[PDB]
Amino acid sequence: SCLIPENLRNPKKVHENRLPTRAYYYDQDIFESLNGPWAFALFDAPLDAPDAKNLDWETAKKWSTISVPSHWELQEDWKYGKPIYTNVQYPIPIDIPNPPTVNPTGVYARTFELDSKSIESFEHRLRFEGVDNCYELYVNGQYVGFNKGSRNGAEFDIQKYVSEGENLVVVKVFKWSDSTYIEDQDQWWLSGIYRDVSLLKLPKKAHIEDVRVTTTFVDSQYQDAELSVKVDVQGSSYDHINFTLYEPED
Amino acid sequence: DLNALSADIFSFMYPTFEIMERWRKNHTDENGKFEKPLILCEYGHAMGNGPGSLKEYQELFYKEKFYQGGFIWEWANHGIEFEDVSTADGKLHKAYAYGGDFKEEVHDGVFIMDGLCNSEHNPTPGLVE
Amino acid sequence: GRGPGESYPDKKESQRFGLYDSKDVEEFVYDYPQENGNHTDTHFLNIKFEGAGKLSIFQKEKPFNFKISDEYGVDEAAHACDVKRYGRHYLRLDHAIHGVGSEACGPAVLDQYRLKAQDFNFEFDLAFE
Amino acid sequence: SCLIPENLRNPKKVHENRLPTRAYYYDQDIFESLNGPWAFALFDAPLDAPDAKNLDWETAKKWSTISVPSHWELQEDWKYGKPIYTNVQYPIPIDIPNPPTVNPTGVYARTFELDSKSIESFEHRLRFEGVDNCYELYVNGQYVGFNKGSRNGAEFDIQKYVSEGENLVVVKVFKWSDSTYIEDQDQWWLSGIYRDVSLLKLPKKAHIEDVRVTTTFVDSQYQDAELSVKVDVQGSSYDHINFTLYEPEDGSKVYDASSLLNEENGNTTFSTKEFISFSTKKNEETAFKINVKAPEHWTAENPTLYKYQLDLIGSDGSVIQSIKHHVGFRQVELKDGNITVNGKDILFRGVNRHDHHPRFGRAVPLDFVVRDLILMKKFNINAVRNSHYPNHPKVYDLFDKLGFWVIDEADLETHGVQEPFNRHTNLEAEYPDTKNKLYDVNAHYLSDNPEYEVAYLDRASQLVLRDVNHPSIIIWSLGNEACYGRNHKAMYKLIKQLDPTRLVHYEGDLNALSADIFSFMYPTFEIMERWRKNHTDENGKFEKPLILCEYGHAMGNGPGSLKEYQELFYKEKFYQGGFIWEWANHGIEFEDVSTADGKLHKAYAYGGDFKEEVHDGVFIMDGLCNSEHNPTPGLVEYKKVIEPVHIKIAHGSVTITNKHDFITTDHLLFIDKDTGKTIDVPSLKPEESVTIPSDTTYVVAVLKDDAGVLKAGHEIAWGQAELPLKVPDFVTETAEKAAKINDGKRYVSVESSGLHFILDKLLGKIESLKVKGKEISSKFEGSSITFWRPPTNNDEPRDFKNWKKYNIDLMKQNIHGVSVEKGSNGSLAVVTVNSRISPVVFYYGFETVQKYTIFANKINLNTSMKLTGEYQPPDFPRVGYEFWLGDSYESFEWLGRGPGESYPDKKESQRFGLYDSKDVEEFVYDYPQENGNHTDTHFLNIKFEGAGKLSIFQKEKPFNFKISDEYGVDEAAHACDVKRYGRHYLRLDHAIHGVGSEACGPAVLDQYRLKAQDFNFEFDLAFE
């Protein structure tokens, strides 16, 4: 079935190059928002979509814009189709793990600016809070990776692909995939980058990757407790960690 | 996972009292001990005028230690705002869409409109009850 | 009777007893038009006429049910805007009414709330001020 | 007067310890938000309020909370009172400068945490973006200061009072003060901390306090420009400053709510595309001037901005502080008697905008302001007037980026001083050329009062200094309706001193003795024209131009005659356009008991609804948009008349004229709507035109690509060829069919195959007309031809008075004779009705002849009406028939103007086409009034379920119609009060009175008035 791309019909291809999942923490100093208007075009199926390895900003620049985050079935004048409601029944034929060959494909593009010092100071990532159904990601005409799981997040290391000045982000989003079979909630079928997109700037030489906090009572009488804090630090250039717990607020 | 072979909790959706009660008795031993409790992950389907008999479910919750309550399906109608031609008027009006309104090949109609709150996320008599 | 909102045999206990005025109440609009606006366990009903006092209505020995509206075509109405309205109001004065249940997905109206087929006997007074 | 505190009754006590005003810049790293829940208590008057020098957090902690920012008259269950609406009249007694002794006092309290290091690292301030009316401020039980000026901001140094750990902020807010007298805008009276509160943390040893950016063209040819940057640094511990200017982003930039509101900086790399750099040297002036090579002009039509970064740099070479903002290269001049931007004499396509939200009042979320502005751009607006005070400081960037010509106005209205005078002297009308003499007599109380000079100057100083770096602001305004006096001259001197780069406006200064512009509100054309001629010399030169700071009062159904104003704007160089009053109705959401229902409904409140002692009723409901800030037919009409491209189709030609000020037509796609194929239109500059030969009837000018906040395909302008009235080719059945005719005692009956016609001879009433399964009958109360409409807001002051006086609503038809004869030229029967149509109690009326010619499938109705009798009314609201439609009635369709309502002096935005009732959302007025008329109707089709259609048309002339089920509109105060019948009716009218703007402004113009005269018209009722 070569008229439908391999990654859309492979249940094991859950992601390509996605960073391991970590506990979520929003930090104003690290999270830069990439929400706003993006260049966007819709295509009948993947084969009509441009090869992102050759897509310039000069070319994409000329497309209509859509605002991120939003669903593409919920636009002014229903420009890109309408919502579909199914409870149980799949809105596609069942031929596991194949999606239909006719498979609405949305391509998103925008740019962001990077400093001379920024690339020296920070490890750069892209974080997508939710994209339905799945997508491939390109930076500066280069393939970064792939992802499935519509209501899960995803982070990707961008450091290798990044340049001083203008940077190009292109996201190819597909409506159906092998994943559709396991996403059949009794709800509206809706597509697109429907959650936040962020550029993360983490300190380069060393930074906090993951944290784990548990509270366990030592006792049958639920009084004294053990507070356990486990931190996974990434990189060598650090000395130690401090922890300060504050008086409670009722 | 009905028998919780790989879960820590028993869970039913929309059961009758008879069905809740049989389950309890089959999982309470001679001592009065049970190994796992029952929750209703979904009950009292809140579609339209209703749900009825939330009272009788609650009586059951308070009465037995085996029952630890439940979660109503659902918080709010999934209506989407759109423009509908009125059957009464011949004119265009703001309305809330469910299956069929966006002219789907296949759809499940009003089944998306099953909340304690309406499409605009405001309380219905269901939530008041 | 029960208020300020609607009440039904198996969905009424949140509506406490009191004296209620139609003017103080925002009538609830369902997203999908259906049976609404009944008041159960009504002790007495006063209907006010401009410059002519009131008409008091009560049922002997047992509280009653009522609805006052100008609406029709609710069955066929797909959305709120599809609901037709008469040029005058009507009183729906009921001895009894079927419960509401959760049968769209779940148990039927429980036995003690079903309006079962049987003989009916009831007396009303229409008392004019 | 010791029972009222000194500071509340002292006009000179404008503030205590307030820091000097500086240019506003939001910085995420410096601004910490103190918004959220605060402890709050309300007190009857100041003397009941606690001494803040002794108030603990432990004590305040126990109070109820209110959320900041919000008004205290807009709380859950109206906990702390209700809003009060006054237009002119003060809601207090006048005893300048004393407020009432009973003076609602709200005390606010919250805490914030301070670090050990924070006090070492930073100078700490408190900034309040707006508090109504005035307040004293305490930190840690210590008095910090005092402030007045409700829509101005204020900063206070907090460093001395601050402690490590828990800090206590207490704010005592008073509703009335000496300041109230100068804050009497036509709006809701609302109180409290209604805008943001922030804790500022500035770097301690040295920091950027103020910045000043000007762009001046070196040249008569508006090419090279001098960019001047002056920075005021506070403290010694810095080396120099750096400035980086970046390559421009064209004004056609795409924006949305999300990107406009994005506030992120710090680690975000501002821009990379460097255009120019500059550095100061150690120990030298922290200011500079640089020559810029032919920069991209900023304009409202193309708001091109150059981003910049300003860095304060320490001895070690590190960045102490940054400011990231933008430069707009533009210059405003009074040149050859015109307001000129970049050499060009511009046109204001403007609107007055208050801060208003239907639930939050003047505490408008930015999200909602963006909503307003996007909508304005979508309806061809290019200018905004900040009536009548500055907005939230963050709004001005939106103007810069979206492109609006902005009049930023001082928070100063004195109107209330006039009211007793108006009443004492029984004053009926004010006129723009003459009215300033009425304000002159009361000026001494405030605007000519030397005790108020400091306050007036402060409103001016605060206005300018906060907003001085926004290229979109081209005019400073001294306030609104504050008479004229020495204080205004003082304001003018100060502003020119502080900001030489802009022009000064003040409408109350008729002769612009201390203003740079002439300004009228609601003038007639005669009045505009006289002024022009008296200020144009023999050479054709004028010294200053005229704008209309307010015109075309948009209250309710209206405004009428925007067309005739616009013709004047384009015709004379002396007129530079104007601003509609107002952007949106000020309705507040509330729960109203329905007059139709006896039940509770959501409605929008105006004066009287919150049961005020004194109020000004519906006068708050005067917007182009409704209370929910959505377009009314007023806005739809405005977009058309101000369209920046003219498209005229006549004589096999399309003439297209570019009516922009700066941009070409190149971004527009011109479509021939008859074929759907584009017309190749050359690039047209401002004022250039082209004639293209074409067979077309209908041409549209639309956006090629997404630009600004507009989408590809958005309609900017359009034109149509005039459509002749074509008689539809309906075929009348003239075949000889026998007909049963019964001329009874009272009722006349005509029965044939597929036909049943019954007329009541006593009344002139069609009891029933049933042709081929379709039924109509007369909607009859008194007369078969009626004249009444539910009065518009514009009808209320005069026309309604007249119509009511002449009993037009009580017109009666008195039948004299009915003639019945057999058909002749193919007709079945002729029924002729002779009557007088005349109201009770009056002589005047119409000798009327109604001739019904009945065919098998058609009814011809010829109406002759001859006006007779002494003491006649000047005009009528309308004249026509009312029919009940049968139960089968389902929808309608018409050839004419649409999709929405149209009236004689408000119709040109509704283009000709075939329209279906089903495709149209009928507009609901906030205040129920005349609506839903369709003028210039060629024909009307009424569809009946399973019985085809009834086609209606008028001979030789287009007609008017409305189809509804509504009644009781006259008495209905709110939408929910409107009554509805169990069936629909057709209002079929020969003619209809215009709409005008007389609630405030000119009467319906003569050619739009339905003048009293004879009427003669023929209708066909053709049944399928």
Ligand SMILES: OC[C@H]1O[C@@H](O)[C@H](O)[C@@H](O)[C@H]1O
């Ligand atoms: O309202 C019907 C509901 O039925 C439940 O069984 C299901 O878990 C829900 O997702 C929803 O489909």
Ligand SMILES: OC[C@H]1O[C@@H](O)[C@H](O)[C@@H](O)[C@H]1O
């Ligand atoms: O709607 C009446 C309006 O009248 C104008 O004279 C005034 O400037 C406006 O602020 C408003 O009062």
Ligand SMILES: [Mg+2]
């Ligand atoms: Mg399901």
Ligand SMILES: [Mg+2]
């Ligand atoms: Mg005023």
Ligand SMILES: [Mn+2]
């Ligand atoms: Mn509908």
Ligand SMILES: [Mn+2]
């Ligand atoms: Mn009302």
Ligand code: NA
């Ligand atoms: Na589904």
Ligand code: NA
């Ligand atoms: Na339990």
Ligand code: NA
């Ligand atoms: Na459902």
Ligand code: NA
């Ligand atoms: Na229905």
Ligand code: NA
């Ligand atoms: Na006022």
Ligand code: NA
């Ligand atoms: Na002009």
Ligand code: NA
């Ligand atoms: Na007003």
Ligand code: NA
């Ligand atoms: Na009215």
